Symmetry: C5
Subunit: 106 residues, 5 copies
């Protein structure tokens, strides 16, 4: 369970797509924090994730609701998600930063 | 321990029923975040879970108390519940979003 | 490790005692969240737990300080305590809800 | 796998806390869960610090939490495990500040 | 999994560099809390970490955004990073304190 640092930045329509690699290994994203960037406005920001569900259909789940003067950072504690996954801002202009661990298994 | 994205949205007249069907494997719901939706009033929101306790009886349980201008998101850190589970808003109009993992055994 | 839902509501004159039976397994309370109920006043609420320490004596312990307009909910991340455990409000009138898991060997 | 006992203490401006090992064989761990301000604490900045050995072998002071009654009365650390010997103290603020956690033992 | 206490302080002109000197065992930095020091102004503080991604390249990630009058402490719950790691203030002058665990197999 070797682990690499992971991160991305979201904007109004700057998605992040985490893909499956053409390796033989398993991969997981263990999401840790969502936090507002210095230039973010004091509006509501909602970060959303999209991935396969249990019965096979795409699901969109909101990870966090952030606002600069109320809650600039949310800690998710190692939210593990199997790729492919898309991360995006459902509202707010961002930037919103996401940090976490990229877990593989050779 | 296979792992899928889970999410739902609750409103005052909209609960969520997590079931698990005529499967053979064991299933667990691992709840990660509870967060207020973009249009939610600045009223008190209380999210409830109902499931079996160890004595065999159904128990109603408060997961989180949320308020948009005080605490829009609560992180539960992987709160596991054995299905069947009903999730509902005990008060507040929502929308309230819940995200987590659906974990499956064999 | 079997896990069942656990929850309770605490008020000024209402301790909560956890419990077990003529049982054969190991039991743990895994406390998850502490949250103020809808009718709680905007007073400071302090939730306390009491259980035996490593020496063997009962020790009272503050789990959380809550205030409705400041921090209505606290997440403990799976705080595990061996029964018997008493939960109570050391101050505030409540209602205060506690949620967690009952774990069985 | 290890056995777990409830742990707690109260810190004030002139009352620190030191984690007591004894003439025993067991490996002990202190797992800290919450830091929360007591009812009578004033509304100043409170900073809780922990003191224990680092890897290279010499003592390090470390900040666990910054708390303020009207902003953030409780901080949950999620099971911060520290090997004894460890000392907990207020680096500033008058308290009382309560600490809760687990005392874990295994051999 | 031997476990030692870890800490550092960050300022506008003072970063922290975590190297384990090449022994033969493996080391991990497990971050726990990011908190503002007593002397910090009430400006936005953003703490970032730099290490390798899975493709071998260095990446910088924001760990936490703090502000004294809003949220002086963020708890990361054991965010493990493989050394070498750089911690720095991307904005704000600090001091910002970091605590966690240094783990050796
Ligand atoms: Cl706040």
């Amino acid at each position: 369970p070797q682990n690499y640092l992971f991160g991305c930045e979201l904007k109004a329509d700057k998605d992040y797509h985490f893909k499956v690699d053409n390796d033989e290994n398993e991969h997981q994203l263990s999401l840790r924090t969502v936090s507002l960037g210095a230039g973010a406005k004091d509006e509501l920001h909602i970060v959303e994730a999209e991935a396969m569900n249990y019965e096979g259909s795409p699901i969109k789940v909101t990870l966090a609701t952030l606002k600069m003067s109320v809650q600039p950072t949310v800690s998710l504690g190692g939210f593990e998600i199997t790729p492919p996954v898309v991360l995006r801002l459902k509202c707010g202009s961002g930037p919103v930063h996401i940090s976490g661990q990229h877990l593989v298994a050779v």
